[PDB]
Amino acid sequence: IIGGEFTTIENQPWFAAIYRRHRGGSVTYVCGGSLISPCWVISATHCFIDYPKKEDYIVYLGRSRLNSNTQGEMKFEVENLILHKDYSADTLAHHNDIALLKIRSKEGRCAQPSRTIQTIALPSMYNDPQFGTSCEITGFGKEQSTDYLYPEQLKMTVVKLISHRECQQPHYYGSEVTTKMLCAADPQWKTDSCQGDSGGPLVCSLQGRMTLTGIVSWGRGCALKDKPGVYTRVSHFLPWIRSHT
Amino acid sequence: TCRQSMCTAR
Ligand SMILES: *Cc1cc(C*)cc(C*)c1
């Protein structure tokens, strides 16, 4: 996250931190995700497409820091890794960039709700906030485009939803952006998601409830003028989600 | 094949 604020998991209790194990025992952070039911985390396919072996991954819930054990955190293995079969990556855009991870602790249990572990609601079909609405994004991604390391502390920021009409302008993304994607940015281009934030939640207070409106997918750079963050539009994938869940 | 989407991925 470029700009924004440091935060803690209590403020973002649906946030899932996804890591990959390597042969020698080292673990590296991969992507974010969101807990949508006790057994299911939703993320982005592009995070996993090159290494689709579910045994390689670890999922933490209730975790505020990248490389430390926060009190009340829960560690999970991935029981099923489901990537979208129509995922594709073009010049700029990632299409159908959505994935599901069925999580299970070593004892075979799903998430236990607590102050630091809560599910986030899904939207209803084709039901998104109006353009101009403020939404929050959360992640352990880069704080600057030139960083090669991720911050140890979880961050959040607040961005505004951008119309499809604006986002498909030539100096924005043109025809690369589709109706199954959502654009969001800072009006002054000072805060944005970045590399390492992929898979994590774009959350909007919708109709009296915190709702998973988007999934961090792609963008041209980070916090660049006229280059919004692009998010998988969750409200256009409900048949897919419920079919696998 | 290098594609720019490798770099746009967040
Ligand atoms: C091949 C290519 C081109 C650009 C502009 C960026 C990346 C990652 C790859």
CATH, residue A228: 2.40.10.10
End-to-end Cα separation, chain B, in angstroms: 19
Tell me how many domains chain A contains: 2
Asked if A36 and A105 sit in the same domain, the reply is yes
Asked if A70 and A110 sit in the same domain, the reply is yes
Nearest to A93 among B5, B6, B10 (CB): B5
Looking at the DSSP bridge assignments, the partners of residue A94 are: A89
Asked if A108 and A40 sit in the same domain, the reply is yes
Asked if A187 and A210 sit in the same domain, the reply is yes
Question: Hey, which residues of A are catalytic here?
Answer: 46, 97, 198
Are A23 and A29 in contact by the 8 Å Cβ rule? The answer is no
| Pairwise CA distance, residues A211 & A204, whole Å | 5
Asked if A17 and A105 sit in the same domain, the reply is yes
Asked if A183 and A66 sit in the same domain, the reply is no
Are A140 and A60 in contact by the 8 Å Cβ rule? The answer is no
The three-state secondary structure class of A71 is coil
Set of chain A residues whose Cβ sits within 8 Å of the Cβ of B3: 89-91
Asked if A72 and A142 sit in the same domain, the reply is no
Site of tokens 């939703």: A42
Asked if A165 and A223 sit in the same domain, the reply is yes
Q: Residue B9: CB within 6 Å of ligand 1? A: no
Q: Shortest CA distance to A17 belongs to which of A97, A96, A76?
A: A76
| Pairwise CA distance, residues A139 & A3, whole Å | 12
Breaks (C-N over 2.5 A) in chain A follow: none
Q: Residue B7: CB within 6 Å of ligand 1? A: yes
| Contact at CB, A195 and B9, closer than 8 angstroms | yes
Token duo for residue A119: 């599910």
Set of chain A residues whose Cβ sits within 8 Å of the Cβ of B6: 89
Q: Shortest CA distance to A133 belongs to which of A214, A74, A44?
A: A214
Asked if A95 and A141 sit in the same domain, the reply is no
Asked if A124 and A225 sit in the same domain, the reply is yes
Distance of CA A186 to the CA centre of its chain: 18
Asked if A193 and A170 sit in the same domain, the reply is yes
Asked if A45 and A21 sit in the same domain, the reply is yes
Experimental method, per PDB record:
X-ray
Q: Ligand 1, atom 5: nearest CA belongs to which residue?
A: B4
DSSP A140: S
| Pairwise CA distance, residues A212 & A203, whole Å | 5
**In which domain, by residue range, is A109 found?**
13-119+236-245
Query: Is the alpha carbon torsion for A65, A66, A67, A72 positive or negative?
Result: positive
**Strands (DSSP E) found in A126-228:** 134-139, 155-162, 181-185, 201-205, 210-218
